[PDB]
């Protein structure tokens, strides 16, 4: 339901992330696992050590889904529809954990994109990630 | 709160590099911009109608310095946050009626501001240490609500 | 957008509430103000006394918006759209308070619907109130 | 947490009426139905395939008696909730990895169960006294998280 303003800021920030999107996805996951260790139990078949190849590969899938969501910003429910079923029905991800990963994504963007991470862009990225989270939790309505 | 000694060390070292005149202002102004319901508590601070207005607002900057001073008090008293924040807990609860969920939000905004200020220096381990600190400050400020 | 099961469960429950919806909205407000006193500061120059005629008036407004949303479950963003600009911009209602009111609405419905408030109907009413709360906070997203 | 004399009396009289063999299972069953991500932690309890299966599940009934017993222990120790949940806090944090938000949800489900079973007797003042109890329990169980 993002305002016009919010879509402009999100595309600009994500544009500059560019080919680093996978790296930043992987760093956001690492920050989440270290800051909020309850979240590690969703990844029992993963090497969660610093610089894990498996976490790098999973970061790419998360980043790709966000890239796709930015490209489909006006129709996010449909662009992430299968992911809601996976996260809610199969994986039973606690809704709190989406707030945790979203926060860790904002921290990662602030650490790498000091020029781009203005207060306006921060507010827009938070609204973009909450909207992504609302879709991924939507089989919890 | 339970920081390991290494986490307390990591937190203290970074905090020494924090600009006391600016970071509290940055964190408060981003709270007001990102979570606009929080403006309800600062309705006398003047124009909060744009990001630029908030971030340049002198009462936001002045108040932010006092907020950062209170975090500095928390970092110097990590084994007694309940006592350190007892007075401020009563103030927020009795006179301001601020929902304690907003204490968690301001702590997360402060973490985003430290990341913005320190870049790669704000590593995942340093962030994990700071999450324990801001969770403990929020917990301590929430005490008198219970 | 509620599931078919949730829409059917909410309509059944709301039909049993029937003409008592305003009564239950007042009781839910009363319950919120007493259990969660921070919420009283959003009604600074209201009479919040037990059985307040003013709280009855407001309980009617809340109950009527919920009854309208039950009739418009497949288009709730449109049906509540007015209230969302209000609660975000003018009132600056903390998103947590929607969770507090929603809980007090469930307690009120439980206390009045001994037969109807089954575990499945409780789950559907929770999803319904969460969906209402999401529309009413949408100007933050 | 501190209940008024009025409030302690009200809490104790209702809790006397509570069926210790059933209300805990009703509350745990409703948690699992209402907030279905919570089933992730209870899959070894067997059949959770429908709301009736969850509510009739023997492991859910059995475990609910223990959850309710922990609440009854807390009601007898409002003054010392941290000690009354000390190792249970460690169990939920270190072994089970439960997010402490769910402790608030289970408390609120138990309140809804008392409302459902006791009807008009679960008055707004009786509810307000129980909200202090279940917040106090959730905070005590969250102690080891911060
Ligand atoms: C911005 C939020 C999120 C996005 C965009 C996202 C995206 C994805 C994607 C694209 C997949 C892979 C689907 C496939 O390849 O078929 C996935 C899998 C998964 N996600 Fe998420 N996710 C998010 C949040 C979360 C959170 C918060 C958790 C848990 C704390 C989580 C846990 C998982 C798990 C466990 C998998 C399966 C991993 C495996 O075994 O391969 N996700 N997610
Ligand atoms: C979590 C960390 C927080 C800390 C450490 C903190 C600290 C403080 C301090 C130190 C003061 C006194 C300022 C003075 O000496 O003049 C204060 C006042 C106040 N705080 Fe907080 N605070 C926090 C969170 C919040 C939040 C989340 C809100 C609102 C959303 C809030 C709203 C206020 C208000 C309205 C005042 C009175 C300001 C005035 O009008 O002068 N605080 N706080
Ligand atoms: C189910 C949730 C809610 C519904 C359905 C709802 C509905 C309404 C309605 C219909 C009105 C009146 C609109 C008009 O006057 O034309 C209103 C006003 C208001 N609402 Fe909400 N509301 C909800 C939640 C909340 C919450 C959680 C709060 C605060 C804790 C809140 C605070 C108010 C206030 C303060 C007013 C204005 C009363 C006045 O000063 O005249 N609302 N709401
Ligand atoms: C907030 C109040 C809660 C209380 C008083 C409580 C109490 C207990 C107690 C007493 C046990 C030990 C059982 C035994 O070994 O006999 C236990 C175990 C457990 N609790 Fe909780 N708990 C609470 C909340 C939660 C929540 C919200 C979750 C998950 C969403 C959870 C998940 C578990 C699990 C998975 C076990 C292990 C059960 C097993 O496999 O045997 N608890 N809890
Ligand atoms: C500080 C602010 C507030 O609400 N309270 C009451 C705490 C409480 O609910 N105790 C039962 C304060 O003392
Ligand atoms: C997180 C969960 C937990 O049990 N604790 C307390 C002690 C512990 O084992 N930490 C390593 C937490 O801090």
């Amino acid at each position: 339901v993002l305002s016009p303003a919010d879509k402009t800021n999100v595309k600009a920030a994500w544009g500059k992330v560019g080919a680093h999107a996978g790296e930043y996805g992987a760093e956001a996951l690492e920050r989440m696992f270290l800051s909020f260790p309850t979240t590690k139990t969703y990844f029992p078949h993963f090497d969660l050590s610093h610089g894990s190849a498996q976490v790098k590969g999973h970061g790419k899938k998360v980043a790709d889904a966000l890239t796709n969501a930015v490209a489909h910003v006006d129709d996010m429910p449909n662009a992430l529809s299968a992911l809601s079923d996976l996260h809610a029905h199969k994986l039973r991800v606690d809704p709190v954990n989406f707030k945790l990963l979203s926060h860790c994504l904002l921290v990662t963007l602030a650490a790498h994109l000091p020029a781009e991470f203005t207060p306006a862009v921060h507010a827009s990225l938070d609204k973009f990630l909450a909207s992504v989270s609302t879709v991924l939790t939507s089989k919890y309505r | 709160v339970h920081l390991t000694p290494e986490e307390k060390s990591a937190v203290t070292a970074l905090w020494g590099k924090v600009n006391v005149d600016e970071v509290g202002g940055e964190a408060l102004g981003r709270l007001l911009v990102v979570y606009p319901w929080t403006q309800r508590f600062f309705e006398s601070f003047g124009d909060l109608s744009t990001p630029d207005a908030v971030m340049g607002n002198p009462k936001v900057k002045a108040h932010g310095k006092k907020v950062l001073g209170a975090f500095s008090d928390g970092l110097a008293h990590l084994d007694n946050l309940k006592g350190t924040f007892a007075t401020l807990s009563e103030l927020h609860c009795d006179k301001l009626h601020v929902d304690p969920e907003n204490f968690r939000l301001l702590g997360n905004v402060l973490v985003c501001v430290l990341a913005h200020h320190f870049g790669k220096e704000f590593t995942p381990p340093v962030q994990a240490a700071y999450q324990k600190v801001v969770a403990g400050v929020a917990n301590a400020l929430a005490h008198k609500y219970h």
Side-chain angles (χ1 to χ4, degrees), chain B residues 28 32 36-49 53-54 57-63 66 96:
Chain B
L28 180 65
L32 293 171
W37 63 85
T38 66
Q39 295 175 30
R40 186 205 169 215
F41 293 106
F42 297 94
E43 290 277 318
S44 81
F45 275 32
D47 180 17
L48 305 173
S49 65
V54 171
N57 181 297
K59 287 157 84 131
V60 169
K61 175 187 183 172
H63 185 64
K66 292 178 229 299
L96 311 171

Side-chain angles (χ1 to χ4, degrees), chain A residues 1-138:
Chain A
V1 70
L2 295 155
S3 68
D6 287 325
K7 291 155 174 142
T8 324
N9 286 326
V10 167
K11 284 185 160 95
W14 210 251
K16 189 55 193 186
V17 164
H20 302 274
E23 178 192 345
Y24 292 3
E27 176 177 330
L29 292 163
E30 175 176 4
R31 288 176 179 283
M32 180 184 70
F33 298 143
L34 284 179
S35 291
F36 311 108
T38 48
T39 61
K40 292 193 289 186
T41 68
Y42 288 91
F43 298 85
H45 287 203
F46 283 59
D47 170 21
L48 296 183
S49 63
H50 173 72
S52 165
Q54 286 179 338
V55 169
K56 268 162 199 164
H58 196 67
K60 183 53 165 29
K61 301 191 200 166
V62 171
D64 287 356
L66 293 170
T67 300
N68 181 246
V70 175
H72 289 273
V73 76
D74 299 39
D75 207 65
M76 256 186 245
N78 296 332
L80 296 161
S81 206
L83 279 186
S84 306
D85 335 32
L86 174 67
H87 287 79
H89 292 165
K90 167 142 103 218
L91 300 168
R92 318 246 72 167
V93 180
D94 186 326
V96 169
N97 295 330
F98 293 95
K99 301 221 151 60
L100 306 176
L101 181 57
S102 292
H103 169 65
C104 289
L105 283 164
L106 289 186
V107 170
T108 301
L109 293 177
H112 285 277
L113 300 183
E116 302 64 21
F117 202 75
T118 63
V121 168
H122 177 175
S124 294
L125 288 166
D126 186 75
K127 294 191 187 46
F128 168 72
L129 296 173
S131 287
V132 163
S133 295
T134 300
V135 176
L136 295 197
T137 62
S138 60

